[PDB]
Amino acid sequence: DAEKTVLEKSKAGAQSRFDSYGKLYDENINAGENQAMTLRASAAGLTT
């Protein structure tokens, strides 16, 4: 029974790693990362 506790409570750690990585994947680019893209690209349009 104690060995069962070891297994399932390590599984809680694996679940926390899995869901945290999925949360980083689904929202891959936040509001700041694309803001830099738009800002950087606006500088490219001044050449003409």
């Binding site: 680019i29 694309n34 893209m37 738009t38 690209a41 490219a44 349009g45 003409t48």
Partner: protein, 49 residues
Amino acid sequence: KMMDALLQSVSQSQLNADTVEDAFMSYLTSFEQVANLKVISAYHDNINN
């Protein structure tokens, strides 16, 4: 050369309707500038036409 301007201008991670629209309007600006020009003079490289 303006299609090479276009490709590297549009190559990025996030593509939206406004970004691609603006990239196209800049391409069209280049195309219009190179289409309105008029010829002045010419030379024929060979003795025979």
